[PDB]
Amino acid sequence: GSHMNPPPPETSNPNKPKRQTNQLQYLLRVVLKTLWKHQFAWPFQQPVDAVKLNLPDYYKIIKTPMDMGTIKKRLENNYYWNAQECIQDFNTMFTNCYIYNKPGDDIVLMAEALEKLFLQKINELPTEE
Numbered sequence: 001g002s003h004m005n006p007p008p009p010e011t012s013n014p015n016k017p018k019r020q021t022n023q024l025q026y027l028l029r030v031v032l033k034t035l036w037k038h039q040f041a042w043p044f045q046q047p048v049d050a051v052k053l054n055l056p057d058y059y060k061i062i063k064t065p066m067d068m069g070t071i072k073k074r075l076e077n078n079y080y081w082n083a084q085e086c087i088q089d090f091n092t093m094f095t096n097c098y099i100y101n102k103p104g105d106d107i108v109l110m111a112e113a114l115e116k117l118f119l120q121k122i123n124e125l126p127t128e129e
């Protein structure tokens with residue numbers, strides 16, 4: 001991709017600790033699966049390509065980018081140690097969108113629909129066993 005977009009967030013790193021948990025399995029099998037097929041998921045399925053979108057200031061503003069494509073790879077590659085790390089990635093993705101864009105913009109309404117779905121599923125995140 002373009003040299004003007006940063007490398008994506010890390011999805012593989014042998015030095016970082018990781019494990020499976022039933023909560024992480026739920027995040028992949030229920031949470032990510034639900035959000036990924038939503039009508040409004042598509043803009044969130046890969047890193048923001050600020051060159052293609054003509055958003056030259058994006059990576060000046062957003063210093064902790066995150067997207068569902070990255071979260072999917074982190075879940076499928078067992079990158080995480082715990083659910084909190086993955087929930088934080090989702091929350092970063094939503095808050096980036098709300099910080100960068102005007103309230104009421106289409107992309108914000110899209111993120112808000114995904115976040116509504118997310119919160120319902122996270123309220124049912126299973127007890128860690």
Ligand SMILES: O=c1cc(Br)cc[nH]1
Nearest residue numbers: 043048097100101107
């Ligand atoms: O303008 C934009 C586009 C995306 Br995708 C995410 C946040 N802001």
Ligand SMILES: O=c1cc(Br)cc[nH]1
Nearest residue numbers: 043053105106107110
């Ligand atoms: O401005 C935008 C950009 C994308 Br990508 C999706 C919705 N609105």
